[PDB]
Each structure stands twice: as structure tokens, then as C-alpha cells.
Amino acid sequence: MLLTPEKLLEAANKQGTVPSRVRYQWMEDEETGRLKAVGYHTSMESGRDQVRVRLLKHDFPNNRYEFWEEGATGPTILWTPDNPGIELPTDTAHGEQPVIPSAIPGLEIPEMDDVSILATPMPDEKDFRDYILVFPENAFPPIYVYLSKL
């Protein structure tokens, strides 16, 4: 099977997930508050290789695409075709990279550039806040994004 736009849409429509050999996170230094982007090689054995897939909603009145996290009282992630790019109404960190088109399940996310991959034990899911955002009519290619802790 291939992770085509149709398959990704199948996952997004049901708030599902897709495997990924690598996941990223914004690690925090409890002594300065400074953040650092780091990635990890996930293990199928582990079960922490799944990444949430979500469909972006088009907000025409605001000429933007938006995603609302669960229980949010306002948009969490925005994407305006005028810039474009990932933007948040908050001052939280975010990194992103387009997903590899119709790739083998688990290899759809290219390894971020200039982002070290640590060989440490897999962090708790609680410390991960990533998503694969899918656009409605594929007006834009699916994109993987990892945000700093809320």
C-alpha cells in the first residue's frame, strides 16, 4: 500500500494516524527555557511510531486554512496562501516539512535538515506534539509539523 493523498485523507477524515520512522520534538531546557529541535528514530515494536493525521479547514472569510486541536477555544495552526507557511496565533515553536508524495508507509516524512537525531530512549507521547496536516482539495501538499509543548 502507498500513502497516497487518498490514503492520507482516509486517515484524516477519521482522526486517525500513519506510521513514521522518524518523529520530531522541541526539547526544553528547564534552566533557561530555551528550546531545541531534535528527532528520534521510532520503533514499530514500541508503538510510538504513529503520527496523527488531520484535515485542515478552509476559512474563506479569513482567507486561511486552519486546524483546531482537541478542546481548543481558538485556531491552533494557520496557513494563508498569501505568504504562505505554517503560522500560529501563539508564540510557540514550530518546524515543518512537506511529506514525501505517495511513499512507502513509514517513510513519508523526510528527516529535517540540520536537526540532530538523538539515539536516546523514546520520550513519552506527552512530550510530542506533531501532526500531518492535510489540505481539502490538496490545494497544497500534506505537511508534517511539530510544535513545542502547549
JSON list of C-alpha atoms in Angstrom, two decimals:
[
{"chain": "A", "resi": 1, "resn": "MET", "atom": "CA", "xyz": [0.00, 0.00, 0.00]},
{"chain": "A", "resi": 2, "resn": "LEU", "atom": "CA", "xyz": [1.09, 3.57, -0.66]},
{"chain": "A", "resi": 3, "resn": "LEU", "atom": "CA", "xyz": [0.47, 6.66, 1.46]},
{"chain": "A", "resi": 4, "resn": "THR", "atom": "CA", "xyz": [-1.25, 8.46, -1.41]},
{"chain": "A", "resi": 5, "resn": "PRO", "atom": "CA", "xyz": [-3.27, 11.67, -0.95]},
{"chain": "A", "resi": 6, "resn": "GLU", "atom": "CA", "xyz": [-6.36, 9.44, -0.85]},
{"chain": "A", "resi": 7, "resn": "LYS", "atom": "CA", "xyz": [-4.98, 7.25, 1.91]},
{"chain": "A", "resi": 8, "resn": "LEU", "atom": "CA", "xyz": [-3.88, 10.29, 3.94]},
{"chain": "A", "resi": 9, "resn": "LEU", "atom": "CA", "xyz": [-7.38, 11.72, 3.52]},
{"chain": "A", "resi": 10, "resn": "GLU", "atom": "CA", "xyz": [-8.81, 8.40, 4.72]},
{"chain": "A", "resi": 11, "resn": "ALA", "atom": "CA", "xyz": [-6.70, 8.78, 7.88]},
{"chain": "A", "resi": 12, "resn": "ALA", "atom": "CA", "xyz": [-7.55, 12.43, 8.38]},
{"chain": "A", "resi": 13, "resn": "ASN", "atom": "CA", "xyz": [-11.30, 12.02, 7.92]},
{"chain": "A", "resi": 14, "resn": "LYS", "atom": "CA", "xyz": [-11.39, 9.68, 10.89]},
{"chain": "A", "resi": 15, "resn": "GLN", "atom": "CA", "xyz": [-8.85, 11.50, 13.11]},
{"chain": "A", "resi": 16, "resn": "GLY", "atom": "CA", "xyz": [-6.53, 8.56, 12.50]},
{"chain": "A", "resi": 17, "resn": "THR", "atom": "CA", "xyz": [-2.78, 8.13, 12.18]},
{"chain": "A", "resi": 18, "resn": "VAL", "atom": "CA", "xyz": [0.01, 6.82, 9.97]},
{"chain": "A", "resi": 19, "resn": "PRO", "atom": "CA", "xyz": [3.35, 5.25, 10.91]},
{"chain": "A", "resi": 20, "resn": "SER", "atom": "CA", "xyz": [6.62, 7.20, 10.60]},
{"chain": "A", "resi": 21, "resn": "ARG", "atom": "CA", "xyz": [10.19, 6.01, 11.05]},
{"chain": "A", "resi": 22, "resn": "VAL", "atom": "CA", "xyz": [11.08, 9.41, 12.47]},
{"chain": "A", "resi": 23, "resn": "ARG", "atom": "CA", "xyz": [9.33, 11.94, 14.71]},
{"chain": "A", "resi": 24, "resn": "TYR", "atom": "CA", "xyz": [10.41, 15.40, 15.83]},
{"chain": "A", "resi": 25, "resn": "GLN", "atom": "CA", "xyz": [10.05, 17.42, 19.00]},
{"chain": "A", "resi": 26, "resn": "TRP", "atom": "CA", "xyz": [11.04, 20.71, 20.59]},
{"chain": "A", "resi": 27, "resn": "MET", "atom": "CA", "xyz": [13.03, 19.85, 23.71]},
{"chain": "A", "resi": 28, "resn": "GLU", "atom": "CA", "xyz": [13.15, 22.38, 26.53]},
{"chain": "A", "resi": 29, "resn": "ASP", "atom": "CA", "xyz": [15.95, 23.34, 28.92]},
{"chain": "A", "resi": 30, "resn": "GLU", "atom": "CA", "xyz": [14.28, 23.60, 32.35]},
{"chain": "A", "resi": 31, "resn": "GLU", "atom": "CA", "xyz": [17.05, 26.02, 33.36]},
{"chain": "A", "resi": 32, "resn": "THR", "atom": "CA", "xyz": [16.76, 28.68, 30.64]},
{"chain": "A", "resi": 33, "resn": "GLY", "atom": "CA", "xyz": [13.51, 27.97, 28.85]},
{"chain": "A", "resi": 34, "resn": "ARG", "atom": "CA", "xyz": [15.45, 27.74, 25.58]},
{"chain": "A", "resi": 35, "resn": "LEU", "atom": "CA", "xyz": [14.20, 25.18, 23.10]},
{"chain": "A", "resi": 36, "resn": "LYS", "atom": "CA", "xyz": [15.97, 22.79, 20.74]},
{"chain": "A", "resi": 37, "resn": "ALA", "atom": "CA", "xyz": [14.65, 20.81, 17.79]},
{"chain": "A", "resi": 38, "resn": "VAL", "atom": "CA", "xyz": [15.51, 17.07, 17.98]},
{"chain": "A", "resi": 39, "resn": "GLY", "atom": "CA", "xyz": [14.25, 13.97, 16.22]},
{"chain": "A", "resi": 40, "resn": "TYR", "atom": "CA", "xyz": [14.06, 10.28, 17.02]},
{"chain": "A", "resi": 41, "resn": "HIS", "atom": "CA", "xyz": [14.01, 7.01, 15.14]},
{"chain": "A", "resi": 42, "resn": "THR", "atom": "CA", "xyz": [10.76, 5.32, 16.12]},
{"chain": "A", "resi": 43, "resn": "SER", "atom": "CA", "xyz": [10.17, 1.63, 16.63]},
{"chain": "A", "resi": 44, "resn": "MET", "atom": "CA", "xyz": [7.19, -0.29, 15.31]},
{"chain": "A", "resi": 45, "resn": "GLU", "atom": "CA", "xyz": [7.79, -2.63, 18.25]},
{"chain": "A", "resi": 46, "resn": "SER", "atom": "CA", "xyz": [7.38, 0.36, 20.55]},
{"chain": "A", "resi": 47, "resn": "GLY", "atom": "CA", "xyz": [4.11, 1.64, 19.14]},
{"chain": "A", "resi": 48, "resn": "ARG", "atom": "CA", "xyz": [5.25, 5.23, 19.30]},
{"chain": "A", "resi": 49, "resn": "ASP", "atom": "CA", "xyz": [5.75, 5.42, 15.53]},
{"chain": "A", "resi": 50, "resn": "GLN", "atom": "CA", "xyz": [2.21, 6.62, 14.76]},
{"chain": "A", "resi": 51, "resn": "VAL", "atom": "CA", "xyz": [1.65, 10.27, 13.79]},
{"chain": "A", "resi": 52, "resn": "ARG", "atom": "CA", "xyz": [-1.78, 11.93, 13.92]},
{"chain": "A", "resi": 53, "resn": "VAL", "atom": "CA", "xyz": [-3.25, 12.98, 10.57]},
{"chain": "A", "resi": 54, "resn": "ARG", "atom": "CA", "xyz": [-5.70, 15.90, 10.48]},
{"chain": "A", "resi": 55, "resn": "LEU", "atom": "CA", "xyz": [-7.61, 17.67, 7.74]},
{"chain": "A", "resi": 56, "resn": "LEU", "atom": "CA", "xyz": [-7.20, 21.45, 7.59]},
{"chain": "A", "resi": 57, "resn": "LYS", "atom": "CA", "xyz": [-10.38, 23.51, 7.27]},
{"chain": "A", "resi": 58, "resn": "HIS", "atom": "CA", "xyz": [-10.64, 26.38, 4.81]},
{"chain": "A", "resi": 59, "resn": "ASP", "atom": "CA", "xyz": [-11.75, 29.65, 6.45]},
{"chain": "A", "resi": 60, "resn": "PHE", "atom": "CA", "xyz": [-12.75, 31.80, 3.47]},
{"chain": "A", "resi": 61, "resn": "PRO", "atom": "CA", "xyz": [-13.91, 34.82, 5.50]},
{"chain": "A", "resi": 62, "resn": "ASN", "atom": "CA", "xyz": [-10.32, 34.97, 6.74]},
{"chain": "A", "resi": 63, "resn": "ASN", "atom": "CA", "xyz": [-8.64, 33.66, 3.58]},
{"chain": "A", "resi": 64, "resn": "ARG", "atom": "CA", "xyz": [-6.79, 30.96, 5.54]},
{"chain": "A", "resi": 65, "resn": "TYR", "atom": "CA", "xyz": [-6.62, 27.26, 6.31]},
{"chain": "A", "resi": 66, "resn": "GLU", "atom": "CA", "xyz": [-6.87, 26.36, 9.97]},
{"chain": "A", "resi": 67, "resn": "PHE", "atom": "CA", "xyz": [-6.57, 23.48, 12.39]},
{"chain": "A", "resi": 68, "resn": "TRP", "atom": "CA", "xyz": [-8.14, 23.34, 15.84]},
{"chain": "A", "resi": 69, "resn": "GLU", "atom": "CA", "xyz": [-6.57, 20.99, 18.38]},
{"chain": "A", "resi": 70, "resn": "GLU", "atom": "CA", "xyz": [-8.91, 18.99, 20.59]},
{"chain": "A", "resi": 71, "resn": "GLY", "atom": "CA", "xyz": [-10.64, 21.20, 23.15]},
{"chain": "A", "resi": 72, "resn": "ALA", "atom": "CA", "xyz": [-9.15, 24.38, 21.73]},
{"chain": "A", "resi": 73, "resn": "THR", "atom": "CA", "xyz": [-11.08, 27.64, 22.03]},
{"chain": "A", "resi": 74, "resn": "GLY", "atom": "CA", "xyz": [-9.34, 29.11, 19.01]},
{"chain": "A", "resi": 75, "resn": "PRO", "atom": "CA", "xyz": [-7.39, 28.07, 15.89]},
{"chain": "A", "resi": 76, "resn": "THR", "atom": "CA", "xyz": [-4.06, 26.42, 16.76]},
{"chain": "A", "resi": 77, "resn": "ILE", "atom": "CA", "xyz": [-2.34, 26.34, 13.37]},
{"chain": "A", "resi": 78, "resn": "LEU", "atom": "CA", "xyz": [-2.96, 28.64, 10.39]},
{"chain": "A", "resi": 79, "resn": "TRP", "atom": "CA", "xyz": [-1.84, 28.56, 6.75]},
{"chain": "A", "resi": 80, "resn": "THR", "atom": "CA", "xyz": [-2.53, 31.52, 4.46]},
{"chain": "A", "resi": 81, "resn": "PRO", "atom": "CA", "xyz": [-1.89, 31.02, 0.69]},
{"chain": "A", "resi": 82, "resn": "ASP", "atom": "CA", "xyz": [-0.71, 34.65, 0.61]},
{"chain": "A", "resi": 83, "resn": "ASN", "atom": "CA", "xyz": [2.62, 34.02, 2.34]},
{"chain": "A", "resi": 84, "resn": "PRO", "atom": "CA", "xyz": [2.35, 31.01, 2.75]},
{"chain": "A", "resi": 85, "resn": "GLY", "atom": "CA", "xyz": [3.66, 28.73, 5.50]},
{"chain": "A", "resi": 86, "resn": "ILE", "atom": "CA", "xyz": [2.86, 27.45, 8.98]},
{"chain": "A", "resi": 87, "resn": "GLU", "atom": "CA", "xyz": [1.83, 30.16, 11.44]},
{"chain": "A", "resi": 88, "resn": "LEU", "atom": "CA", "xyz": [0.40, 30.05, 14.96]},
{"chain": "A", "resi": 89, "resn": "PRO", "atom": "CA", "xyz": [-1.60, 32.75, 16.81]},
{"chain": "A", "resi": 90, "resn": "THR", "atom": "CA", "xyz": [0.53, 31.85, 19.82]},
{"chain": "A", "resi": 91, "resn": "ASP", "atom": "CA", "xyz": [4.27, 32.28, 20.36]},
{"chain": "A", "resi": 92, "resn": "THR", "atom": "CA", "xyz": [5.09, 28.56, 20.35]},
{"chain": "A", "resi": 93, "resn": "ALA", "atom": "CA", "xyz": [7.85, 26.95, 18.32]},
{"chain": "A", "resi": 94, "resn": "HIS", "atom": "CA", "xyz": [7.10, 25.01, 15.16]},
{"chain": "A", "resi": 95, "resn": "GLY", "atom": "CA", "xyz": [9.04, 23.14, 12.49]},
{"chain": "A", "resi": 96, "resn": "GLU", "atom": "CA", "xyz": [7.68, 21.58, 9.30]},
{"chain": "A", "resi": 97, "resn": "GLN", "atom": "CA", "xyz": [8.47, 19.76, 6.07]},
{"chain": "A", "resi": 98, "resn": "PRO", "atom": "CA", "xyz": [6.26, 18.57, 3.21]},
{"chain": "A", "resi": 99, "resn": "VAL", "atom": "CA", "xyz": [5.51, 14.86, 3.25]},
{"chain": "A", "resi": 100, "resn": "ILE", "atom": "CA", "xyz": [7.03, 12.65, 0.53]},
{"chain": "A", "resi": 101, "resn": "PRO", "atom": "CA", "xyz": [4.27, 12.04, -2.10]},
{"chain": "A", "resi": 102, "resn": "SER", "atom": "CA", "xyz": [2.82, 8.51, -2.23]},
{"chain": "A", "resi": 103, "resn": "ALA", "atom": "CA", "xyz": [5.67, 6.99, -0.22]},
{"chain": "A", "resi": 104, "resn": "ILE", "atom": "CA", "xyz": [6.02, 3.62, 1.50]},
{"chain": "A", "resi": 105, "resn": "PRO", "atom": "CA", "xyz": [4.07, 3.72, 4.81]},
{"chain": "A", "resi": 106, "resn": "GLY", "atom": "CA", "xyz": [6.64, 4.77, 7.40]},
{"chain": "A", "resi": 107, "resn": "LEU", "atom": "CA", "xyz": [8.96, 6.67, 5.04]},
{"chain": "A", "resi": 108, "resn": "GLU", "atom": "CA", "xyz": [6.72, 9.59, 4.13]},
{"chain": "A", "resi": 109, "resn": "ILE", "atom": "CA", "xyz": [8.49, 12.03, 6.45]},
{"chain": "A", "resi": 110, "resn": "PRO", "atom": "CA", "xyz": [11.93, 13.25, 5.26]},
{"chain": "A", "resi": 111, "resn": "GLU", "atom": "CA", "xyz": [14.45, 13.91, 8.00]},
{"chain": "A", "resi": 112, "resn": "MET", "atom": "CA", "xyz": [14.52, 17.62, 8.88]},
{"chain": "A", "resi": 113, "resn": "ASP", "atom": "CA", "xyz": [17.67, 19.42, 7.81]},
{"chain": "A", "resi": 114, "resn": "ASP", "atom": "CA", "xyz": [20.24, 20.48, 10.38]},
{"chain": "A", "resi": 115, "resn": "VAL", "atom": "CA", "xyz": [18.19, 18.73, 13.08]},
{"chain": "A", "resi": 116, "resn": "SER", "atom": "CA", "xyz": [20.05, 16.15, 15.12]},
{"chain": "A", "resi": 117, "resn": "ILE", "atom": "CA", "xyz": [18.52, 12.72, 15.63]},
{"chain": "A", "resi": 118, "resn": "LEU", "atom": "CA", "xyz": [19.22, 11.51, 19.17]},
{"chain": "A", "resi": 119, "resn": "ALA", "atom": "CA", "xyz": [19.76, 7.81, 19.95]},
{"chain": "A", "resi": 120, "resn": "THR", "atom": "CA", "xyz": [18.09, 8.01, 23.34]},
{"chain": "A", "resi": 121, "resn": "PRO", "atom": "CA", "xyz": [15.12, 6.01, 24.62]},
{"chain": "A", "resi": 122, "resn": "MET", "atom": "CA", "xyz": [11.81, 7.16, 23.06]},
{"chain": "A", "resi": 123, "resn": "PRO", "atom": "CA", "xyz": [10.28, 10.09, 25.00]},
{"chain": "A", "resi": 124, "resn": "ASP", "atom": "CA", "xyz": [6.74, 9.83, 26.41]},
{"chain": "A", "resi": 125, "resn": "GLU", "atom": "CA", "xyz": [3.99, 10.61, 23.89]},
{"chain": "A", "resi": 126, "resn": "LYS", "atom": "CA", "xyz": [3.13, 13.55, 26.19]},
{"chain": "A", "resi": 127, "resn": "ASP", "atom": "CA", "xyz": [6.30, 15.31, 25.04]},
{"chain": "A", "resi": 128, "resn": "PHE", "atom": "CA", "xyz": [5.36, 15.04, 21.38]},
{"chain": "A", "resi": 129, "resn": "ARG", "atom": "CA", "xyz": [3.04, 17.47, 19.65]},
{"chain": "A", "resi": 130, "resn": "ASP", "atom": "CA", "xyz": [3.20, 16.69, 15.96]},
{"chain": "A", "resi": 131, "resn": "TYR", "atom": "CA", "xyz": [0.71, 16.27, 13.13]},
{"chain": "A", "resi": 132, "resn": "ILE", "atom": "CA", "xyz": [0.45, 15.59, 9.43]},
{"chain": "A", "resi": 133, "resn": "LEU", "atom": "CA", "xyz": [-1.90, 18.28, 8.12]},
{"chain": "A", "resi": 134, "resn": "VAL", "atom": "CA", "xyz": [-3.91, 17.52, 5.00]},
{"chain": "A", "resi": 135, "resn": "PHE", "atom": "CA", "xyz": [-5.42, 20.22, 2.78]},
{"chain": "A", "resi": 136, "resn": "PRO", "atom": "CA", "xyz": [-9.01, 19.93, 1.45]},
{"chain": "A", "resi": 137, "resn": "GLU", "atom": "CA", "xyz": [-8.58, 19.63, -2.33]},
{"chain": "A", "resi": 138, "resn": "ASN", "atom": "CA", "xyz": [-4.84, 19.20, -1.98]},
{"chain": "A", "resi": 139, "resn": "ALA", "atom": "CA", "xyz": [-4.50, 22.89, -2.74]},
{"chain": "A", "resi": 140, "resn": "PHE", "atom": "CA", "xyz": [-1.20, 22.28, -1.01]},
{"chain": "A", "resi": 141, "resn": "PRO", "atom": "CA", "xyz": [0.82, 19.12, -0.37]},
{"chain": "A", "resi": 142, "resn": "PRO", "atom": "CA", "xyz": [0.44, 17.36, 3.00]},
{"chain": "A", "resi": 143, "resn": "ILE", "atom": "CA", "xyz": [2.80, 18.76, 5.60]},
{"chain": "A", "resi": 144, "resn": "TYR", "atom": "CA", "xyz": [4.32, 17.37, 8.79]},
{"chain": "A", "resi": 145, "resn": "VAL", "atom": "CA", "xyz": [4.57, 19.83, 11.67]},
{"chain": "A", "resi": 146, "resn": "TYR", "atom": "CA", "xyz": [5.92, 19.51, 15.24]},
{"chain": "A", "resi": 147, "resn": "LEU", "atom": "CA", "xyz": [5.14, 22.19, 17.82]},
{"chain": "A", "resi": 148, "resn": "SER", "atom": "CA", "xyz": [6.67, 22.91, 21.21]},
{"chain": "A", "resi": 149, "resn": "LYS", "atom": "CA", "xyz": [4.74, 21.75, 24.29]},
{"chain": "A", "resi": 150, "resn": "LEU", "atom": "CA", "xyz": [1.49, 23.63, 24.98]}
]
